[PDB]
A paper describes a structure:
S is the major surface glycoprotein on the SARS-CoV-2 virion and is involved in viral attachment to target cells via the interaction of cell-surface-expressed angiotensin-converting enzyme 2 (ACE2) with the receptor binding site, at the tip of the receptor binding domain (RBD), in the S1 fragment of S (Lan et al., 2020). In-depth structure-and-function analyses of 27 potent RBD-binding mAbs isolated from vaccinated volunteers following breakthrough Omicron-BA.1 infection reveals that they are focused in two main clusters within the RBD, with potent right-shoulder antibodies showing increased prevalence.
Omi-6 and -32 bind at the same site, although Omi-6 binds a little lower and Omi-32 is rotated clockwise by ∼90°. Omi-32 and -33 are clonally related and bind in the same way. Omi-33 showed 41-fold greater activity against BA.1.1 than Omi-32; this is because mutations in contact residues in L1 and H1 allow Omi-33 to better tolerate the change at 346 in BA.1.1. (E) Omi-32 causes large conformational changes in the G446S loop of the BA. Antibodies Omi-9 and 32 perform poorly on Beta and Gamma and may be sensitive to E484K found in these VoC but tolerate the E484A change in Omicron (Omicron shares N501Y and K417N mutations with Beta whilst Gamma has N501Y, K417T).
Residue numbers in the entry:
A (entry chain E): 335 to 358, 369 to 516
B (entry chain L): 1 to 216
C (entry chain Z): 1 to 124
D (entry chain H): 1 to 217
The structure:
């Protein structure tokens, strides 16, 4: 059987900039369930070459970016989906698992990058981003910032700043 | 890089008072990435506040944080005796580096106490070994700011004295200080008068205690 | 190009019924989905019903499960939201929204196409 | 709930090596990043190094780059810090703490002392009470505990029977690499000729016990 429990019921997820990929129906209303290029009721009647399971965590206001033909900080610099993306995107509120009770600073995001990410590109570079004219040479200073920032997941925030675990299923 | 400066250096309050601690940043900072700590002597730093205004699990509600941009504040609504300690602020969250503040000490408060001054000549047994240490004691004074200067034949010494300060006493809230002048035996027996002059808020005039080498 | 036409609101007593309609125009094919968002006084847009058109699969939040019924009439390309056993809780401005996908979302921003809201008021 | 416990910290001559250990319990260790933070005596907290969980990126403060190496064994729930080419300025209490911004729960804190000396006991010299320098009816006497290594020493008066008015000052590291401190006690001047005053100095590293009687001059 395809290891779907290992991805959905995993104890922790990876950051959106270093999203993990696992090379491999009824749900409930509190699950964001969007599909592109294919119908969910027809998945049992189709055979595919490879099924990739990408998992990561973002905040609520950024779930809209995990979609084809979208722009933003997460799509351009962390995780981009192609314009002809064939698959579904799944997301749920995981505030009881990745917030103050647990205290999981496992979810990062990329703030600065020289160009956009190509579809299905993962950039784990931690080189000081040059935002000015002078070379940085690995020194955090003016116009030379660290390209990774943190998520400050608090309990008081309102869904828009709460953690959502995203599982993107690609059908090749 | 970012530098975190705390003010004031020493906060002198009584139990039951309201404490206001400051943390100023060299740059504008997102309020999502500011922390506060409490550290007691011999203990690890215990997290109080994260994200400028959130209390960690277990922190009493008399601790409150605020601020945005460059100015942040830790407020203690009511000082309990357990709250007197050292507090640091931190600019975490952005880069891996964890820049910390310089520290603000919250100590007990008290009436002004003038120091009792005593001077100790070096022992004849230590002079057998070639060194002469003169000790100047400042006993049970408050506040902590105190000046100790060594005079050898009315000549001001510098670079040959070290100070030690006791922790604020639990019983009377005073401080004590010992300044030790270290000279060679040869230098010690070249001169006659040895005095340490003390200036403190509780003294109307600076007090000088002295002894002449060789006298009883 | 793409346009959603909403109608059907009004004033009703507690317990009555109401039929909202969302008419989708400039869609090439059946590969889109409709969602119904209601915006209570002082509340955010909240999905209550979803319809994946290509699959004809409905989804409802639990508070409206047995009272609300969503369906589609193919002829006029219109999605209907049949609201029965209406309660004062259901008073809100209702929106229908469209996106080029098959599925459902709680996030309004995930829908690039909307319609002009219709007022639903339930009181005595 | 969760707690950490460190070890390994100890005296080490400059240029030599030492490895610290941090034992974690009560949480899924492999899911959290870890930080070493140090604090020199009488100074503030200085960040040392981080072992991120996500990619495995290791970052070191500029003061320790090339000399310190951080590592971890998730199967044993243990964090390590290899300290090579140690310098005097590395003397500090080193704290093991989570990377979870900021850090939730820290560790005990071991004390690494980098100094080039040998174990040596202290010489005890009397600080004799004066016959004329009586500050308002009270006299001061004490003991100078000089030239020992390493920390600490304990000072009691009259085998613990004298504790009121006693002040044992913190030690200072002299330019000789050896420690020195004074312990004093204030007593009534009328009892200087009647009461015997003895300071009991104990230095366990060198197994040295000294009783020095303090008498007026």
């Amino acid at each position: 059987l395809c290891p779907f429990d290992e991805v959905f019921n995993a104890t922790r997820f990876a950051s959106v900039y270093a999203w993990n990929r696992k090379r491999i129906y009824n749900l409930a209303p509190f699950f964001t369930f969007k599909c592109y290029g294919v119908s969910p009721t027809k998945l049992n009647d189709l055979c595919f070459t490879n099924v990739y399971a990408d998992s990561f965590v973002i905040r609520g206001d950024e779930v809209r970016q995990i979609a084809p033909g979208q722009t933003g900080n997460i799509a351009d610099y962390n995780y981009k989906l192609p314009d002809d993306f064939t698959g579904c995107v799944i997301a749920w509120n995981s505030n009881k698992l990745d917030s103050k009770v647990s205290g999981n600073y496992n979810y990062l995001y990329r703030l600065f990058r020289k160009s956009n990410l190509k579809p299905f590109e993962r950039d784990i570079s931690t080189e000081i981003y040059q935002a000015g004219n002078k070379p940085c040479n690995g020194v955090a200073g003016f116009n030379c910032y660290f390209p990774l920032r943190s998520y400050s997941f608090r309990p008081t925030y309102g869904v828009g700043h709460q953690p959502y675990r995203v599982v993107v299923l690609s059908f090749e | 890089a970012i530098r975190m400066t705390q003010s004031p250096g020493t906060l002198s309050l009584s139990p039951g008072e309201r404490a206001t601690l400051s943390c100023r940043a060299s740059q504008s900072i997102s309020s999502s990435f500011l922390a506060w700590y409490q550290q007691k002597p011999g203990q690890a730093p215990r997290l109080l506040i994260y994200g400028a205004s959130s209390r960690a699990t277990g922190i009493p509600d008399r601790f409150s944080g605020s601020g945005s941009g460059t100015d942040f504040t830790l407020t203690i609504s009511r000082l309990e005796p357990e709250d007197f300690a050292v507090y640091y602020c931190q600019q975490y969250g952005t880069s891996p580096r964890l820049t910390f503040g310089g520290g603000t000490k919250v100590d007990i408060k008290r009436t002004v106490a003038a120091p009792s001054v005593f001077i100790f000549p070096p022992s004849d047994e230590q002079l057998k070994s070639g060194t002469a240490s003169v000790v100047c004691l400042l006993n049970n004074f408050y506040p902590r700011e105190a000046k100790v200067q060594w005079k050898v034949d009315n000549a001001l010494q510098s670079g040959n004295s070290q100070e030690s300060v006791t922790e604020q006493d639990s019983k009377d809230s005073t401080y004590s200080l010992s300044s030790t002048l270290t000279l060679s035996k040869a230098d010690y027996e070249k001169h006659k008068v040895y005095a340490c002059e003390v200036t403190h808020q509780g003294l109307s005039s600076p007090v000088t205690k002295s002894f002449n080498r060789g006298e009883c | 190009q793409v346009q959603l036409v909403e109608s059907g609101g009004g004033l009703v007593q507690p317990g009555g019924s109401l039929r909202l309609s969302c008419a989708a125009s400039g869609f090439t094919n059946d590969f889109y989905s409709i969602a119904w968002f209601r915006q209570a006084p002082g509340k955010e847009r909240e999905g209550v019903s979803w319809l994946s058109v290509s699959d004809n699969t409905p989804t409802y939040v639990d508070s409206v499960k047995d009272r609300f019924t969503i369906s589609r009439h193919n002829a006029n390309n219109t999605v209907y939201l049949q609201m029965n056993m209406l309660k004062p809780e259901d008073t809100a401005i209702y929106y229908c929204a469209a996106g080029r996908f098959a599925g459902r979302d709680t996030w309004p921003s995930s829908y690039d196409y909307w319609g002009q809201g219709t007022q639903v008021t339930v009181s005595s | 709930e969760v707690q950490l416990v460190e070890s390994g910290g100890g005296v080490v001559q400059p240029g030599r090596s030492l490895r610290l250990s941090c034992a974690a319990s009560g949480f899924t260790f492999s899911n959290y990043g870890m930080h070493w933070v140090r604090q020199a005596p009488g100074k503030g907290l200085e960040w040392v190094a981080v072992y991120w969980y996500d990619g495995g990126n290791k970052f070191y403060a500029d003061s320790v780059k090339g000399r310190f190496t951080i590592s971890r064994d998730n199967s044993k729930n243990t964090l390590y810090l290899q300290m090579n080419s140690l310098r005097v300025e590395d003397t500090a209490v080193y704290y093991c703490a989570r990377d979870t911004a900021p850090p939730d729960y820290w560790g005990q804190g071991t004390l690494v002392t980098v100094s080039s000396a040998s174990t040596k006991g202290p010489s005890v010299f009397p600080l004799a009470p004066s016959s004329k320098s009586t500050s308002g009816g009270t006299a001061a006497l004490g003991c100078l505990v000089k030239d020992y290594f390493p920390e600490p020493v304990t000072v009691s008066w009259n085998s613990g029977a004298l504790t009121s008015g006693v002040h044992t000052f913190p030690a200072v590291l002299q330019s000789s690499g050896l420690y020195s401190l004074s312990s004093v006690v204030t007593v009534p001047s009328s009892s200087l000729g009647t009461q015997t005053y003895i300071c009991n100095v104990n230095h366990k590293p060198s197994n040295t016990k000294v009783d020095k009687r303090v008498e007026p001059k």
